[PDB]
């Protein structure tokens, strides 16, 4: 199948921070999931990855040097990006995947969200 993703069309950073909320087409709750934020039209850089597994506290992280924070919420995940640089102004795309229970589930490429860091 294909999960749905609804995200804000734009987000103006306040104090070089913003809140990236991703609205999904999925679950009341409890499965093993890997949420992802990617920056760029060529979606190169993966800004953040909030991992979940039923219970076990949400494990957010970044391999790219972003001060990322993640908050769960049923059919949504919110990426709290801090210390964003003005040169990081770009289109960010949300991604969601379930790895258990099977089968593998993925999202249909969203319309994205332009983050304008002033």
């Amino acid at each position: 199948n294909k999960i749905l993703v609804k995200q804000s069309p734009m987000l103006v950073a306040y104090d070089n921070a913003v809140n990236l909320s991703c609205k999904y087409s999925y679950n009341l709750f409890s499965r093993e999931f890997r949420a992802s934020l990617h920056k760029g039209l060529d979606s190169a850089v993966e800004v953040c990855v909030v991992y979940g597994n039923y219970s076990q506290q949400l494990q957010v992280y970044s391999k790219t040097g972003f001060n990322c924070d993640g908050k769960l919420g049923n059919e949504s995940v919110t990426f709290y990006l801090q210390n964003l640089y003005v040169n990081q102004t770009d289109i960010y795309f949300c991604k969601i995947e379930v790895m258990y229970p099977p089968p593998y589930l993925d999202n249909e490429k969203s319309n994205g969200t332009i983050i304008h860091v002033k």
Partner: antibody
Amino acid sequence: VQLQQSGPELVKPGTSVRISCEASGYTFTSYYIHWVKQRPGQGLEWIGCIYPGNVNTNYNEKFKDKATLIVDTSSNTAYMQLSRMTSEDSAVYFCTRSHYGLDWNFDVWGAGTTVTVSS
Amino acid sequence: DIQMNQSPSSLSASLGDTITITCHASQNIYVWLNWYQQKPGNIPKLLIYKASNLHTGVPSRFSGSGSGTGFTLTISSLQPEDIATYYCQQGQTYPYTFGGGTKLEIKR
């Protein structure tokens, strides 16, 4: 959580052998399977990885042609194909995994498969 | 890709000695670099992941620190059982890359 690897194999210079590595003791589709080669006396280098589930794969440009990563979700087996071999292919190939969500490192290694490419 | 430059290519120390190894990275890997131990003819085992995070079961005599470009592994109170070769690997960017390894000899 064991990682069983194939026995040593002798390969005649030119041919292609496909070693294996079957997981057991955890959820196969919740981890990447990485392959790394260690030449005798030398350090070890990352060949490529594969993620059973969406069958996505990643290769190191130093092994683009030879290395072909295949997966077997039924027998929890991860295969590694080394095509067109030479005395530069002779080394011990290791099997290991990485957590899919928290992809930070390789904590479970196979015991390896020594490969000789002598005629 | 990224280059791994381990420092002591080899090193001999006595029982109880608190040695130290170094691994410099060509560019910024942040805190994504792990350390491994591989005894003679044996399989390599994870010692330290994420710069300072020890792996379950690794004694506390093993320590690790660093960020960005500089990284270091410290083993205090050496034991014969620590005779092995130590590799540094980065887990930030594909392709993953390990170091040259460092050999250790417990002097008796």
